[PDB]
Design a protein around this ligand. Structure first.
Ligand code: FAD
Ligand code: FAD
Ligand code: C17
Ligand code: C17
Lengths: 499, 494
């Protein structure tokens, strides 16, 4: 029954909030809908795989809150394999390379590719991380999809195809589904295009030894029986002196404050008394999650490394079930594996198949991309379709369709009386990631500490010291990258010399 | 506890289904979240207005099922006032007109406007009513917003501004929010642009004497104690012999079958066991409802009639709170009033104001458009902001953002085990309206009758005889409307 704060949701955000609150001396309870903690992180263990992350997995430089939280829990990271060459597979052929971006040789195409990435970042710098709706052209940008933006910007099909794969991979949604403003904010708040797509020096640099699901489990250990499993919240009543939170299995909890640490749309699964204010009531029906199947095929050895491929494949084409892969081999070099994502519409289309049918398509694709018959001999397969999860709604995160962020975005983390809002969707730095979950959980716990009169207002938002274990190389550009014209810029230059 | 069918929701659709099954001899229960029936219909009564519809109100020709149902309940309709001239207010001046569409005088603008309305209807002819995802260009049209379509189509700002108002009024959403495929389907399954926008011989022809809220009320009267108010469903368990339906107030119902008669996205408020299949699980997070404030300003007399204006106003531009009005005067000529809609982003923007502030902005606008100081002296005001309703989500109806219809649309009315889907969103003719609520409720009730072996499969979908009281006249076009070129068509001749 009685405590100081009820946290709804026991993913990384809810658990980080509850930890911070418990450490400050408050009585907290965490109500978790599932028979497990971790939410969109989930570490499967069995004898065949040892452990494997089926949800959120990668961490990297500039993600200093999840690194510090995980380090304090006694966790360690290891580097994702990028020793050998990456592959870009396009129009049925593979092209090995080094560096974060596939190289482009054709000079006109090079200008178009260079201008594409440069412009994403140019536009992003006009967008405040904490208030994207305050960008000067916020309305214009929000009223366009990413497909429309790409249509205006990309003068070559080569750039437009790569850019489409970029969007599908970043937000598990089609370019026609998402707001240009939202997507430009999303990339910028992770530190830009280079940071977001990079393995070395970027978001996919590292994984946690033993799995990311340990973060949530270890905090559950510290909190003990304050974590209540299989307590889906159905009802929040704020009409009396203390808040009442009711669960599906018939229990009632009384609290001074509530943290909602669930994806924004899952807020719909709760009946509110009094009803939510209008802006929030409608916002929660306008913010879906993307569609992805995360698939892991195991092999006897990491045979790709022998042909000088690191296991990274960027695979363009409608026939390809998987558009992106990484080496998922253990740091000890055993349980050789390839992780791949089935993205957006393909997750919907391929969900119709059996597990065995999907394994077969993946192996056939990998054999072709890697030019290797060994890829047709899996020893094991694990997969997870996040579209089927009642208590997630999708993965990795919430996307904004056109027109939504400028109209409703300002209420995302606005308190509703004594309900405060956590979850990765409400973060301002790596929103959508385990990193943003930690930022949002800890910020919402501090909003409650400030309301209780325990901390001053200036301590609600707190900087994080850089990790000493995972240093961040700065993002740099060359002089030519900076000053080379776009395609229409060069055309304008030609019309000027000719006139 | 125990019955044959539990219907979740007591709006028109859920009540229609329950009535059909009751009349068949089955034992029905209706679980309704609110302290009232009607849902997105709501008739307020007080001495100042007598009665007023603050949600769904209008009915018209080709809406035969709502007309039959209401007649059986003892209801009568009357005609919305369209005797005098309509007004199109553009660039700060009023231009009175007759006929459904505002006239265009510039020859280039004329061609552009003509082409727009014509093209909406041509594109709709390729969209099947019962399967819009089967349109030959479904993906291409689904992957574009209506804003993109209008930018391509409309060569003048005049046409683009009227087209925009059209979208905003029809679906209470912005052009950039909505799929082109879904919008074009929506228009097509109402019978086309003329039918949808017309008062005479269209959707706004008539209203119910005493209010549309009487439809649900009178069915509730007929169902006895089978309707349970303040029973929001929170849980549906299908793992056993009988379906188990649990309510927020701790009650438990057991039935052979369930009809879900609530907006698709409101299905999010129910915890399901076993979980819903993947496609429906994601579909119900992808389908918002629009945003509207319905506002009624009352006057001593319908003074506009003295100036040969009927009270219909089509008001262009960003600055105007209301883009569209109709005369809301009672048949007897008393309780004079103007009904107006504050639409889409204006509902969001103006909601922060007080009721009295919105009243003043409305009266000043109507004074300017009607050219009458009489509009400045209202006797009463009523309004309803539908965006604030927990158990509606919005009004009038669900819209589909780009990409959604083709990817998810086929699961909208696919049964989940022993759960069948009603609600106006599931209709194939006047979906979004009271008419479509009836169609979908009665169809869902018959799917279950068929599941019980009571009727054959060919009796699940049933045609409706035309109303004798509200007969439909055909929509016609002229030779020039059909054959005049578009702007780029005239350019190609030059
Ligand atoms: C799914 C996924 C995610 C993911 C990704 C790949 C996939 C396939 N890769 C990532 C990566 O490599 N690196 C990274 O940093 N993030 C990655 N992502 C996203 C990441 O997993 C998420 O950003 C993060 O896990 C989100 O955390 P958050 O704490 O904000 O949210 P949650 O995990 O969804 O947890 C919410 C909890 O709430 C419970 N719930 C839901 N409804 C209720 C009710 N009504 N009552 C009580 N509890 C409720 C959920 O069960 C959950 O535990
Ligand atoms: C709001 C509105 C609607 C409207 C319109 C103008 C406005 C401002 N103009 C219309 C018009 O002139 N002519 C017309 O035919 N339609 C017009 N519309 C739309 C029309 O009202 C709707 O299409 C129709 O009313 C929809 O009926 P339906 O029965 O399909 O849906 P509903 O009214 O929303 O009823 C659903 C009921 O379900 C209850 N509910 C919701 N959740 C639960 C749970 N969990 N448990 C139990 N009950 C639940 C609702 O409270 C509601 O009663
Ligand atoms: O955003 C999340 C994310 C999770 C992930 O596992 O891999 C990514 C890989 C990305 O980029 C890989 C890449 C490299 C070169 C070109 C292109 Cl288009 C993409 C971008 C985001 C991600
Ligand atoms: O769709 C619902 C709807 C409810 C209504 O009350 O009035 C309408 C009026 C409409 O058209 C009026 C109109 C006339 C002439 C031009 C334009 Cl753009 C609009 C269209 C839909 C509606």
């Amino acid at each position: 029954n009685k405590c100081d704060v009820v946290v709804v949701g026991g993913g990384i955000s809810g658990m980080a909030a509850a930890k911070l609150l418990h450490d400050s001396g408050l009585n907290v309870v965490v109500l978790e809908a599932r028979d497990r903690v971790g939410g969109r992180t989930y570490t499967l263990r069995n004898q065949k795989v040892k452990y494997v992350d089926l949800g959120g997995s990668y961490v990297g430089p500039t993600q200093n809150r999840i690194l510090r939280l995980a380090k304090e829990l006694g966790l360690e990271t290891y580097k994702v394999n990028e020793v050998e060459r990456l592959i870009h597979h396009v129009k049925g052929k593979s092209y090995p390379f080094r560096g974060p971006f596939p190289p482009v040789w054709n000079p006109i195409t090079y200008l178009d590719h260079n201008n594409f990435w440069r412009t994403m970042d140019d536009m992003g710098r006009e967008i405040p991380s904490d208030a994207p709706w305050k960008a000067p052209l916020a309305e214009e940008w929000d009223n366009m999809t990413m497909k429309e933006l790409l249509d205006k910007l990309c003068w070559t099909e080569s750039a437009k195809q790569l850019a489409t794969l970029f969007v599908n991979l970043c937000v598990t949604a089609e370019t026609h589904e998402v707001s240009a403003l939202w997507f430009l904010w999303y990339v910028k708040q992770c530190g830009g295009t280079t940071r977001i797509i990079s393995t070395t020096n970027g978001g996919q640099e590292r994984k946690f030894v033993g799995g990311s699901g340990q973060v949530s489990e270890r905090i559950m250990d510290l909190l003990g029986d304050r974590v209540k499993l299989e307590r889906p919240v159905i009802y929040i009543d704020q009409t009396r002196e203390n808040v009442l939170v009711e669960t599906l299995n018939h229990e009632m909890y009384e609290a001074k404050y509530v943290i909602s640490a669930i994806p924004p749309t899952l807020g719909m699964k709760i009946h509110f008394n009094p009803p939510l204010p209008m802006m929030r009531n409608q916002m929660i029906t306008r913010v879906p999650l993307g569609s992805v199947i995360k698939c892991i095929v195991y092999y006897k050895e990491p045979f790709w490394r022998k042909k000088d491929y690191c296991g990274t494949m960027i695979i363009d084409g409608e026939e390809a079930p998987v558009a992106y892969t990484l080496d998922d081999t253990k740091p000890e070099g055993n349980y050789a594996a390839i992780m791949g994502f089935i993205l957006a519409h393909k997750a919907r289309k391929l969900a119709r198949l059996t597990k065995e049918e999907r394994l077969k398509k993946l192996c056939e694709l990998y054999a072709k991309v890697l030019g290797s018959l060994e890829a047709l001999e899996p020893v094991h397969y694990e997969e997870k379709n996040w579209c089927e999860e009642q208590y997630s709604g999708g993965c990795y995160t919430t996307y904004f369709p056109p027109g939504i962020l400028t109209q409703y975005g300002r209420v995302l983390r606005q308190p509703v009386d004594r309900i405060y809002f956590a979850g990765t969707e409400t973060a301002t730095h790596w929103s959508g990631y385990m990193e943003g979950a930690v930022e949002a959980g800890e910020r919402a716990a501090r909003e409650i500490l400030h309301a209780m009169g325990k901390i001053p207002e200036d301590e609600i938002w707190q900087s994080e010291p850089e990790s000493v274990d995972v240093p961040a190389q700065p993002i740099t550009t060359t002089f030519l990258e900076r000053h080379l014209p776009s395609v229409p810029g060069l055309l304008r230059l030609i019309g000027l010399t000719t006139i």
